[PDB]
Amino acid sequence: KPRIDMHSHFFPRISEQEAAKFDANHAPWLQVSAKGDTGSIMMGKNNFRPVYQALWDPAFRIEEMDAQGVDVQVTCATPVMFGYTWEANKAAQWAERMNDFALEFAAHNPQRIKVLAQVPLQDLDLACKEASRAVAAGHLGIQIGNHLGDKDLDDATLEAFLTHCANEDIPILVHPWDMMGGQRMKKWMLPWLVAMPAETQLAILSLILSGAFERIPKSLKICFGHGGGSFAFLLGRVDNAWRHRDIVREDCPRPPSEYVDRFFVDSAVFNPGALELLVSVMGEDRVMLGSDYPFPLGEQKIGGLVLSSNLGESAKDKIISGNASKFFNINV
Amino acid sequence: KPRIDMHSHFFPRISEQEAAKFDANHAPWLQVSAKGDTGSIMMGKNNFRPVYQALWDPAFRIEEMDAQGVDVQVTCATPVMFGYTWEANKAAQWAERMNDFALEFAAHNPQRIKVLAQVPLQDLDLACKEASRAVAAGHLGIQIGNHLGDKDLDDATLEAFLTHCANEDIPILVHPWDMMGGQRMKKWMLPWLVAMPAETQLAILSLILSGAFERIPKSLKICFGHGGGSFAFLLGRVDNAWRHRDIVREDCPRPPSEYVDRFFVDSAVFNPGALELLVSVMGEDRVMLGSDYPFPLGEQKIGGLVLSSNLGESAKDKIISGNASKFFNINV
């Protein structure tokens, strides 16, 4: 039973110059210290966030995986890489380049390192083509952000994308990104603590309340990252609203709670009680170990929360290993 | 064994002529049908919200309360009545009129209907007066919105108000309103299902992360409406952030979860799993029965989720009765 950690991120060796050729102001690149141990994601000439070797170096990453007890990691774009606001053809060329970097990263050891691709989701046609190209080149699926500006997952272009993926057997991880909140949540990591869980919840409900699960084939494999946000906990509020209000019930024929059999969530909720309630709502078959390696708010002892739960042995094995193996078809 | 519902709402019997005196376009009033069981809250000459008789009629309410098994009910402003956008002086006099109306509604049976007052929270001076004035007139505390625009509860102006209330032993109920989310939650009541819980979590976290509870006297009686949103379930994430980023730890000298003994939440969470998680977090002494009567999304069998739960008889008596008795000082 190899521990599979199915939610982690990477960032490729791109220089200022290469990024500039796409967008001098908005294309992210990687600055590495002379020493080679630390670095920063840059945007234009500005420091975006500080980072360390494990995000760009697959050999260094292998050492930490050994140290952690992680046998297989699935890793994908850092969300600042998405480029969802750029011109389509440019975002397409970018996506391909990033996905190639991701394959080259995993080529260091394709047994223990699996990658998901990004897509120019602003353009449905180009997004489908990149999704297919990348999977047929080695990627085990796609990571998308959870919205495109004012477009949420109920949007016909995003629904059409999920449907293409269901049709071609391409798993999706939905990652919250580009957080709401306007001006309100600047200090103390509030976008991460408030807006992010709200974003993921909104993605799920957008699928549910629009009736989109009635249209998307049941074969779609889709996981919502970062514990599904606050979804599991406020689901009661949503069923209540659906039972008692026309406008809530209108596009959604079955109790919202019944739609949990249509998706997955990762396990990153940082609390025993939250995990227990997460597993209660979703069922043990629908929660997968994800850490958010190698960022600093990520689970520092990968799998620790699950292995130390008062869940059954049966269930623990599915969450740390079983489910993702099936979900991503990583042949154990 | 007396049942106390501490979260319900009311709307006064204001004539269109009396409303137009404050603001012909933005000041809320009540239109009542022939039969006398139907109404609309209006904004000028437009239908703002359709409402039913229990919202404005004490006699009718007094009877649903008899039907429901609720001995005492705390009631307060519908958030449309807040008028936080108004000019400080126009609001002060609006607040007083709403609060004279609230005391009239209470006077129909002051043993069973208790009231909280609204305040012109935009101007500190006028809000403190109205608070002390309203309480001494018979109000048991105040209801405040969770934010004013981008001033969250970490705003020093708002702190001072919380502290002014603390020393007068004026209890406060913090209610979500004016939900974040802009152009993104237009259907299926998503403001209420996504933004509302996030607002309330924000409100709590701005107190904890800013260090406000270090500076507000422990005598503060403050309660966060609607279960405190997603607060209890996301709390583990908050501690994780605190432990791993020193910017989260800067004004918050102890782990964020330690401050749970500084506030209360109501019980309105619509799921037994969620109720259990909520109590586990807050403690059985810090959760009060609130229904959100008489709104359609309000609990239909008031007390029903608590009374059917797997909690002990001791826990149930505190939530239904014990806690709210002490908090609002309603003597049995």
Ligand SMILES: [Co+2]
């Ligand atoms: Co992540």
Ligand SMILES: [Co+2]
């Ligand atoms: Co309410």
